[PDB]
Amino acid sequence: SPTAAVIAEVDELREKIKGSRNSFRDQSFLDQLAQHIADAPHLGRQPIARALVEDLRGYASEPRLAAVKAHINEERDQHIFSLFDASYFPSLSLEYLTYETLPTNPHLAARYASPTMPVNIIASSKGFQSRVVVALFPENHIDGIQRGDDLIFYFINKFVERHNRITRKMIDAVMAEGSFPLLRGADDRTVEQASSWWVRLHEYHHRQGDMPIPEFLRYKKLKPLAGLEELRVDVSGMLVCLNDPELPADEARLAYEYILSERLLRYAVEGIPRPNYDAVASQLLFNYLSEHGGIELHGGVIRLCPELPAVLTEFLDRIQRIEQRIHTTSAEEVQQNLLEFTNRYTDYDPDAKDYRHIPFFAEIKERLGV
């Protein structure tokens, strides 16, 4: 494969520079890296590799990857190639991938517009093969810059994999029979459609409300608050799927089931030994819905109440009431009120200043190995 030879050349350069991350912005290093890319028989002739070499060679006077980002944002082709520094995606250094785009619903893309690219990875260098790397954000390039119109990529093939490995067996073990009928036996293309709706609604709603990100990002990185923000936007997305009549009814109900099953099950067991940010918020959701009549526990399995849409609306309204006071109080005062809400419905240890998995999901982690 010509692409196979390109990626082989990238993986060898990646191996050569693995011990050199502290030099990734040093011009002596970048000049040498650029030359090695330029001289790579297959990689060096790719248009996107011409762009990266240009950006790297100019980095001492312009610390941006403007030519690379212009190629990517204009979708000149379906190749992504760059030098990365993303602390939460540590496997990424010099990396290359090819992707394929997915069908898009016109109303969804118009009404809930964002620069989001749900794609499948077709081929990729080693860094992009890590299970951790489920997306690619503009600030992940070494220049660390993001613009509101930069494209953001989500690797839907990885979310399909995670759904089939974790969520499906949790649905079987944890939900009352008939809870997610459209998901039952659904093929990978159906899960792919649902997941692509999820990411599109997710990115759109992050930018909405009284404390949108990135504006208030630095107030929403604390574990409980990062999770609660994730949950704000995904509950918004579930409600859009339930309420917006211009979305196709079959696809919308499927996306609803996908987002709800993921937030009620897969995200709820994330993290060992303590829950991660997603799981704290999913456990808040679980306990909130339990105590407010949205779900019921019978024989250890979750029944979705017919009233759930009303309770989800109550929940999102509650979060929005807390955030609305940003107009009369400080960001820090709002944070304390979001933490107080979170802690009412989660297992917070005040001496460790951290959370424990609630017993319901601790038992499921032990039973299912999730």
Next chain:
Amino acid sequence: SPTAAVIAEVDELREKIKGSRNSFRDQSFLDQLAQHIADAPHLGRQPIARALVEDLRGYASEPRLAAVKAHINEERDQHIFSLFDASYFPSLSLEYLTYETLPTNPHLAARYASPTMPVNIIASSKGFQSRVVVALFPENHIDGIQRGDDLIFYFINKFVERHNRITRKMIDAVMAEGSFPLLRGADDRTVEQASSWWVRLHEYHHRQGDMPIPEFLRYKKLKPLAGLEELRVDVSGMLVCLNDPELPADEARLAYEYILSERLLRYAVEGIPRPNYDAVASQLLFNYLSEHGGIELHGGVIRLCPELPAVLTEFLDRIQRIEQRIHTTSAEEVQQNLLEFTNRYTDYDPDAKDYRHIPFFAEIKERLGV
């Protein structure tokens, strides 16, 4: 097996009460549980079961499991049976195990004495079969009481299993050849002895110093501080193994290798997505040793320097200098100085107020699946 019939009855009672944790101190519940234990054909005959029945029936007036713990602490036999509520061992409710004790060196047990019981589990009920449950502490019983002379149990078979499954693989993948020569190819009986030394020294040193636990426990539960306290005691234990000439030379060197390999490798990769308390402190140690000449990295392989004992002594001296100021400053002021030290050598995210695996161990987690 007569013990298999006992455990089967316990496991059946455990299933019956799994939904009732909120009732575990309700006297109506306890009366019923006690009656069911008393009436168990095999279980109910056991001296320790009669002790628990008596404790449970008296709980409304004396919320203590005094009879059970007197049986256990006196080693009246080698059975442990109680009703547990340990937030970090969530699998434990009504549980039963039989154990066998392990050899101990006489000088070690006299000079570093503590109420510690390194044991192998012979048989156990389901709660104790969780890989999470590596030890049993007196406050893990429902009464929540610990006294300084209560026996503390460590399940050495589980530590042997973890050393075989994780540490051995990391030694081969990460360490320069000859790094841990006594541990290489060592059999389970040998790792058992080393791990037994580790736990005895660990418990002993937790009670030593200017900020021992449990006295200062509530200041040492924050993730970095909990890890640093683990590391303080295990570095103390390494140094005893190197320095105390009344310990047998071969066994002491083996224990040194065990404690060092565990803290340098296995504990360093603990926690997903973020390091847990152990891993934060182990990454502190890694970077401190790297920066101060105790270890060297060559193409991603760790060499242990001949000077490492002197650098370990410097590291422990530094912790003790920070803690000594408890005598002239508040425990909060000491906490802040222990955090400052930790953060110099770890990857602290100031906006998340939490830690990331340092790149060296993030890569090993990816490479080895640990």
